[PDB]
Amino acid sequence: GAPATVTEQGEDITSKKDRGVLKIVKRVGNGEETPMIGDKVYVHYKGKLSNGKKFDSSHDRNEPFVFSLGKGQVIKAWDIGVATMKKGEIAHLLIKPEYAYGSAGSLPKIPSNATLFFEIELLDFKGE
């Protein structure tokens, strides 16, 4: 399955090189430009616990997810990962709990020490 493929073949886009954030590009985007900190970002995503019952998606509510990149308004893995993406890129991220919700987790949806997997499509990014 997809998490497996990322474990085995995904690249470590973390600074510390601690395999906390692994990424495969599943569909290439357009241009060479990727978003700066503070840029307004527009994405679709599907997320799940790497092995678990909780599953979440923006496609479901058919509204794009919008956040300000690099400000810690999302889990750290997203600030790291989305910054490496180009407009129109779809990527797969596998994320250790240190770059996600840690030991404390976040009920109802996230257990303790949870590894997360996301498919993310980067739709657009605009200047602050």
Ligand X SMILES: COc1cc([C@@H](C(=O)N2CCCC[C@H]2C(=O)OCc2scnc2C)C2CCCCC2)cc(OC)c1OC
Active site residues: 45, 55-56, 75, 101, 118
We find the least distance from the C-beta atom of residue 54 to ligand X, in angstroms, to be 4
Residue nearest to ligand X (CB): 47
Where does this chain touch ligand X (CB under 6 A) — which range of 13-21, 22-30, 53-61, 86-94? 53-61
Helices (H), the chain: 2-9, 58-61, 76-82
Q: 35: which DSSP letter?
A: P
Supply 40's token pair.
């307004």
Spell out the residues 6+ positions from residue 127 whose beta carbon is closer than 8 angstroms to its own: 39, 40
Where does this chain touch ligand X (CB under 6 A) — which range of 7-15, 16-24, 27-35, 102-110? 102-110
**Residue 29 or residue 52: which is nearer to ligand X going by CB?**
52
We find the least distance from the C-beta atom of residue 96 to ligand X, in angstroms, to be 13
- One DSSP character per residue, 110-128 reads B-TT--EEEEEEEEEEE--
Spell out the residues 6+ positions from residue 88 whose beta carbon is closer than 8 angstroms to its own: 27, 28, 29, 30, 121, 122, 123
Interface map 76-95 toward ligand X (x if CB under 6 A): --x-----------------
Interaction site with ligand X (CB under 6 A):
45, 47-49, 54-56, 65, 73-75, 78, 106, 109-110, 116
